[PDB]
C-alpha cells in the first residue's frame, strides 16, 4: 500500500567521501591515484520521507549519508528494473546479522518491513542464484557509506563520525574504511532503500544521496597512516597545478599544467557516387525461374539496392542471412551483388545452408562455407504445378564428384556405372543424370515447388557500388569534425579544397606524411584539411601563503575560440 511521501531539497557536497583506495599502509607521503570518487562541491539531493517514487538510479556507484539516530533506516536493494523478470540484490540489515540474496523477486511499489516480515518486500523467489550471510554493518552522529560495483565485484566502505549540532555537512576530513567485497556480477541501474515501521505508525526520515565519477585524486597520509587531506585534480586550474607539482603549496611564479584542444562534434558520411537505382523487379518476379541444375546469375552494380521493396515483389515470409543482417543491408555498402534464382522442392528448402550435404548441394548448386548473403524462399505451387504434372524442371542425380562452391553443371550425357562403355545407349549400367521434378497441386507441403533467390554480397575490397541512398551532408565549412573515409579515421577542421586533384587523384599527402585533402565518392569534391585549434595552458599565481587567486593564460590563441 502507498502510505509514504517524500520531498527533495538540494545542497552542496563540500569536501566529503574519500575512501582508502587500496588496503596498503604508508606514512608521511603524498600518493596520487585514479579511481571512483565524489567530485568536490557537487550536487546533493537532500531527501526527506514522511508518513512516492523510490526509483533512485544507481549509475556506477552510490554515496549515502544519514543523521538519524533511531536506526529507522535498514538495508538496500539494487537492480536494473526490479521485477521478477531479472535478478536483484537483497542486502538487508538486521540487529543480529546481515543477509544478501540474488533472485527474481517481485517487489511492490514500496517494499518495507512490517516489524519482522518481508512479504511486502517481495511476493516470492523463483530462480535464485546467490545467498550470503555475515555480521551486520550498522552499529549526534553522521553515518556515511559508499557502495560500488567494478568488474562484477560489489564493494562497500563505511564510516561513523561524531557530529555536533550542525545543520549541514560539517567541513574537515573523514576517511572511509573498507568493509565488504562480494562477487555478484550483474547489471544494476537503480537502487532503493527500505524502512521499517511498527504497527501502522507515523514516521519521518532524512538522508543524502550522491553519485560518483572516475577522477584522479591526491591524498596526504600523516605519520600514522590516517588520511588528513586530499586534493582533486579537475576542480580548478590551481588544483591541477597542485596535482602536477605534487605538493600542497605553490610558490610565486608561472607553471605549465596541460594542453587544450577543440573537441569534434559530429561525423561526416561520404558514400559512393549515385546516378541510378537497382532493378530488383526483374529478378524476384519475372514469371520465370531457371532450373536448379542450370541456375541464372545476375550481376548488380552501380545502383542503390532498396531491400525494403523486396517484400513487395514476392509473397515470402522473411529473409535469412549469414554474414549480414536483413535490416542492416541498407547501411553496409558492397562493390558487387549476385542474384541466383531457381526452383527446388519443398523439402529441399532446408538444403541451402553452409556446412550441409545433399543431392542438390554437391550435384546442382554449391556455395562457400564463408557465404555472406541472404536467401529468400517462397512457395510457388499456384504457378509451377499442373494437374497433369510439371515436367520442364529437371535436376541432376549422378555425378563423379562433388561440385565446388559457385559452380554450375549444364552439360548432359549418359552416366556410366559399369566397366563397359555406355556407347551412347542407356542400357545396362547406363543411366540419365537428369530427373524431372514431379509437381502436382495435390502433393504435400514438402513436395510443392519453391522459388529460391540467393543474393550474395561482396565485401569492401574494390570501390563500392551497391548500397542505400545515404545523403552526403556537407560538413559545413568551419567545424572541428571527424571523418571516416573507406576505413580511414581522422579529425580536423576542413574547408573546401582549392587544390587541383586531377581526376585520378583521390588522396593528398602533406609534407609531414599525413593527409591534407580528402575525396568524397558521392560527388567528385576534394576537401581541404587543417588541424583543429589547440594550445597550452599556464597558471600565474603568487605564493600560497598570500592568496589562492590565480590567472590562466592560453598560449597562442586570441580570445575568440573557447
Amino acid at each position, epitope marked *: 500500500v502507498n502510505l509514504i511521501t517524500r520531498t527533495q531539497s538540494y545542497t552542496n557536497s563540500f569536501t566529503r567521501g574519500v575512501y582508502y583506495p587500496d588496503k596498503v599502509f604508508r606514512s608521511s607521503v603524498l600518493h596520487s591515484t585514479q579511481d571512483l570518487f565524489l567530485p568536490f562541491f557537487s550536487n546533493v539531493t537532500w531527501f526527506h520521507a514522511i508518513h512516492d517514487n523510490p526509483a533512485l538510479p544507481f549509475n556506477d556507484g552510490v554515496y549515502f549519508a544519514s543523521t538519524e539516530k533511531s536506526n529507522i533506516i535498514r538495508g538496500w536493494i539494487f537492480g536494473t528494473t526490479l521485477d521478477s523478470k531479472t535478478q536483484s540484490l537483497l542486502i538487508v540489515n538486521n540487529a543480529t546479522n546481515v543477509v544478501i540474496k540474488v533472485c527474481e523477486f517481485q517487489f511492490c511499489n514500496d517494499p518495507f518491513l512490517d516489524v519482522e516480515s518481508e512479504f511486502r518486500v517481495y511476493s516470492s523467489a523463483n530462480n535464485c542464484t546467490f545467498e550470503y550471510v555475515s555480521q551486520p554493518f550498522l552499529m549526534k552522529n553522521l553515518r556515511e557509506f559508499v557502495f560500488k560495483n567494478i568488474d562484477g565485484y560489489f564493494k562497500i566502505y563505511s564510516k561513523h563520525t561524531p557530529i555536533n549540532l550542525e545543520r549541514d555537512l560539517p567541513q574537515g576530513f573523514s576517511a572511509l574504511e573498507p568493509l565488504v567485497d562480494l562477487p555478484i556480477g550483474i547489471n544494476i541501474t537503480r537502487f532503493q532503500t527500505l524502512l521499517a515501521l511498527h504497527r501502522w505508525t507515523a514516521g519521518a526520515a532524512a538522508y543524502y544521496v550522491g553519485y560518483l565519477q572516475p577522477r584522479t585524486f591526491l591524498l596526504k597520509y600523516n605519520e600514522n597512516g590516517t588520511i588528513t587531506d586530499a586534493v582533486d585534480c579537475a576542480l580548478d586550474p590551481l588544483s591541477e597545478t597542485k596535482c602536477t607539482l605534487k605538493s600542497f603549496t605553490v610558490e610565486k611564479g608561472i607553471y605549465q599544467t596541460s594542453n587544450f584542444r577543440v573537441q569534434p562534434t559530429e561525423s561526416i558520411v561520404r558514400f559512393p557516387n549515385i546516378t541510378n537505382l537497382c532493378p530488383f523487379h526483374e529478378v524476384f518476379n519475372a514469371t*520465370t525461374f531457371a532450373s536448379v541444375y542450370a541456375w541464372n546469375r545476375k550481376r548488380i552494380s552501380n545502383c542503390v539496392a532498396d531491400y525494403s521493396v523486396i517484400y513487395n515483389f514476392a509473397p515470402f515470409f522473411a529473409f535469412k542471412c549469414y554474414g549480414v543482417s536483413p535490416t542492416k543491408l541498407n547501411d553496409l555498402c558492397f562493390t558487387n551483388v549476385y542474384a541466383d534464382s531457381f526452383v527446388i522442392r519443398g523439402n529441399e528448402v532446408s538444403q541451402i545452408a553452409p556446412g550441409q550435404t545433399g543431392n542438390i548441394a554437391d550435384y546442382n548448386y554449391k556455395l562457400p562455407d564463408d557465404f555472406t548473403g541472404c536467401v529468400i524462399a517462397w512457395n510457388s505451387n499456384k504457378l509451377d504445378s499442373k494437374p497433369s504434372g510439371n515436367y520442364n524442371y*529437371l535436376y541432376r542425380l549422378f555425378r563423379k564428384s562433388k561440385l565446388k562452391p559457385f559452380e554450375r553443371d549444364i552439360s548432359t550425357e549418359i552416366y556410366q556405372a559399369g566397366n563397359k562403355p555406355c556407347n551412347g545407349v542407356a542400357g545396362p549400367n547406363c543411366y540419365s543424370p537428369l530427373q524431372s521434378y514431379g509437381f502436382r497441386p495435390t502433393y504435400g507441403v514438402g513436395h510443392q515447388p519453391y522459388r529460391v533467390v540467393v543474393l550474395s554480397f561482396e565485401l569492401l575490397h574494390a570501390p563500392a557500388t551497391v548500397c542505400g541512398p545515404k545523403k552526403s551532408t556537407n560538413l559545413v565549412k568551419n567545424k572541428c569534425v571527424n571523418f571516416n573515409f573507406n576505413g580511414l579515421t581522422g579529425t580536423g577542421v576542413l574547408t573546401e579544397s582549392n587544390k587541383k586533384f586531377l581526376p585520378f587523384q583521390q588522396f593528398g599527402r602533406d609534407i609531414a606524411d599525413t593527409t591534407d585533402a580528402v575525396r568524397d565518392p558521392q560527388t567528385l569534391e576534394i576537401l581541404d584539411i587543417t588541424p583543429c585549434s589547440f594550445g597550452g595552458v599556464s597558471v600565474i599565481t603568487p605564493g600560497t601563503n598570500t592568496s589562492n587567486q590565480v590567472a590562466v593564460l592560453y598560449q597562442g590563441v586570441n580570445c575568440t575560440e573557447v
Partner: nanobody
Amino acid sequence: QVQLQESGGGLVQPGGSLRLSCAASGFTLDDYAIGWFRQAPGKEREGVLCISASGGSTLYADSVKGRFTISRDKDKNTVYLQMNSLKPEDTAVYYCAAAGRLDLGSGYVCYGYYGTDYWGKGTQVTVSS
C-alpha cells in the same frame, strides 16, 4: 520460361511462296517433338509437319507432302517452315507447338498429333485465290 512465338505470313497469290518460323525460348527438355498445326475456320485443327530432335527424321502429312518444307535450327532453337505452290485449301490459322517425346518400351520415338504441352499465339496465312 517455355514460350513459343511465330513470325511471317500474309496474303499471297496461289502458287506463291512463304516462310514461317516459330522461335522456342526457354526450352530445357533434353528430348522433345515439336509440331506445326493449322486450323481453317470451320474445321478442326490437325498436325502438319514434325521432325525428330535428335537427328531430324522427316515426317510429312499426305496433303502437304513435298510442298511443305520444314527445317530445325538448334543454334537459335527455332523451326523454319518453307511454303511453295500454295493452294486455296491452305487458307488457315497456322500455329506452332512443342511437346516432349514419347518414352514407351525403352525407346525414343517422336509423337505428335494431340497431347501437346505448349502452344503459340499462331499466325494467319491467306491465299488470294
